[PDB]
Symmetry: C2
Subunit: 396 residues, 2 copies
């Protein structure tokens, strides 16, 4: 099982990244014997996952012999996001590109009702888009919360009332397809490594700034997930010893000063105290509004964003110290004020981590944010490279 799987993935990754490629070149690059290369490629050819123009075809039809390449056309997968009060279902081509996507509002809260609705929506999707669906190989689903990826179990999550929902097994039962379930921040860090702005390093950290604060840590080309998909959670690191009480019951947690709500609340408090701002007449201040005010030079909004940067910089300095990453990516709507935020983050990184660690350290914006299903695409790409999905497709 795991025997063939690993080598099949290694060979397929070489073909995907380096094709058209000869069997002899695959043998040299993979360090596998020609006999092994032959057996692996034959299974992949017969499954129509890869293709070549053979010598016999070349002579027969009067065109050049061409080395092995991935045969993505016709192959597809579903990538889903279970978000706060909604479900996104997207159809992707195997290479990762979105073909169709729909966002469905979800007013269910309790586990059984959420699951019933989600399966109904998958069924409806297959019926509605039947003509555009071809060879669907798998389903990926990403979501906030505690997720056991190995088992496909959501232990608990924001918004919904969930306790150990067997999301992967349930979707697999309803579809017969392999299902890949992951925490969204962790899967997003993988998408940045496979498709995004951390392709150039094997050691990086993605900092997700939204409702909560989380780091998706890539070490040696793979994301750290853990049994609960929570490796890298930043929100309950104490950053102010004498700070506000957190929902967790402790004081001075990062999320008391750096969550979307905490930033909006700060702006609201300073305006109420009589600090001047272009936001002082605005109803229902959003993070977008704050970022647009700061970007446009509003002293109060600038100051609020800089303070946020200092706190983020402190948390990021911690991660740098522990992981020695080669790159830092920032993701979230807060990137709309990056000209203001980044210098604040960077100065605190310089002051709170080793010079040698942060010397050539790029601080950059993530490629993805509103592409909610690209994280699921990354899970599928990595399952092809791990050989897991290849064997499922070969097996039938």
């Amino acid at each position: 099982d795991h025997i063939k799987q690993i080598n099949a993935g290694r060979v397929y990754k070489l073909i995907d990244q380096k094709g058209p490629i000869s069997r002899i070149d695959l043998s040299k690059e993979s360090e596998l014997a020609p006999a092994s290369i032959t057996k692996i490629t034959r299974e992949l050819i017969d499954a129509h996952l890869i293709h070549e123009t053979t010598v016999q075809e070349a002579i027969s039809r009067g065109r050049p012999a061409v080395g092995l390449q991935t045969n993505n056309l016709g192959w597809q997968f579903l990538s889903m996001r279970l978000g706060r009060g909604y479900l996104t279902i997207a159809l992707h081509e195997l290479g990762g590109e979105v073909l169709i996507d729909t966002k469905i509002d979800i007013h269910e809260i309790d586990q059984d009702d959420v699951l019933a609705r989600l399966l109904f929506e998958i069924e409806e999707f297959f019926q509605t888009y039947a003509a555009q669906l071809d060879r669907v190989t798998s389903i990926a689903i990403t979501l906030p919360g505690l997720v056991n990826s190995e088992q496909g179990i959501v232990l608990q999550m924001p918004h919904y009332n969930v306790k150990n929902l067997a999301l992967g097994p349930e979707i697999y039962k309803a579809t017969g397809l392999p299902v890949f379930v992951a925490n969204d921040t962790r899967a997003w860090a993988l998408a940045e490594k496979l498709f995004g702005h951390s392709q150039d390093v094997d050691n990086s950290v993605l900092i997700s700034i939204h409702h909560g604060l989380g780091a998706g840590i890539v070490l040696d080309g793979r994301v750290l997930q853990g049994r609960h998909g929570n490796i890298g959670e930043l929100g309950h690191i104490q950053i102010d010893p004498q700070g506000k009480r957190c929902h967790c019951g402790n004081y001075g947690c990062l999320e008391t000063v750096a969550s979307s709500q905490a930033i909006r609340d700060q702006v609201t408090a300073r305006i109420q105290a009589g600090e001047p701002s272009c936001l002082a007449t605005v109803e229902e201040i959003s993070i977008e509004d704050i970022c647009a005010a700061a970007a446009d030079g509003d002293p109060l909004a600038v100051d609020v964003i800089q303070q946020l940067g200092r706190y983020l910089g402190a948390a990021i300095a911690i991660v740098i110290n522990l992981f020695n990453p080669e790159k830092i990516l920032i993701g979230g709507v807060i990137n709309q004020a990056k000209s203001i935020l980044y210098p604040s983050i960077e100065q605190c990184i310089r002051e709170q981590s080793l010079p040698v660690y942060h010397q050539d350290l790029k601080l950059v914006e993530s490629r993805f944010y509103k592409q909610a299903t690209m994280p699921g695409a990354a899970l599928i790409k990595q399952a092809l490279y791990d050989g897991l999905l290849l064997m499922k497709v070969v097996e039938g």
Copy 2:
């Protein structure tokens, strides 16, 4: 190569932990076909790494047929520590137990001279202990500093003047034996998982308190090392925003308050300022002296240890937040005052990490500290289980 290797290690680990065991039981447990089990066990038997009493032997010699067991007797390895101003060479039996150990004082500083001395000492060891040496399979070496384990390269280290010393390749050239090189803190965390006080969990953190402060992080049964063997370094995390200048040039680093030197310096300063203590007449105060004073009820020493615990607790709370470990181990001479230190650490853990994360969280003393070569023993045991060393032994 990697094909056979992985399965050979999986089978060998089953035999080591569960033998005497039948081939059918190995087939069921490993999920490998009998044909594969046969091929793997045959190579391991012929290499004399495992043994059984076959049916033919049982009938022939009138004793019971006995399932496969590891055949450790006769097999050995060397485990070395390059410490500050010394080299320890120990001969171990393959199961991990020490047979001979010697500590050699080393007054060399520069890379070339250090390496020349170390190879001379290995040569001398083989000659001196020739009668006690049997089948030496490998050499493990652990040391403080930045270590690339994959390559066997020491990038830099304390005490010695080192820059990218190819320690593994050089020892391999001088001996023909496989060489396993690792950072000492990381290899120690592995020894605790394989031989020590974290055998019962797959997710743990070892906190090493000595010259520096480091966490050896075990995730899913394996230690996080990184390309530089420095994943988990704690010493330059800023724990006091308005603190002492560190050797790194930044202010308020953990090692400014928690290194062995910083503790001794605190005691020295408070006595000079006129604070009463049983240590106030003692020349050359050691950490052992401070711990013995605290354990014996000296108010000043107690207060110094409690303050240390608060700072360690803050750093450990950070690691808990990021990793959600199932167990925390503390290693170092400071364990001589654990009755005083641990409650201080624990209260700060409660106040600076999620209740759910630290509820059933045991804080315990490490099994090893003065067993300087047990970390190297762990590297060898894990290389057997990974199958790497098995294949080297089979290959001849």
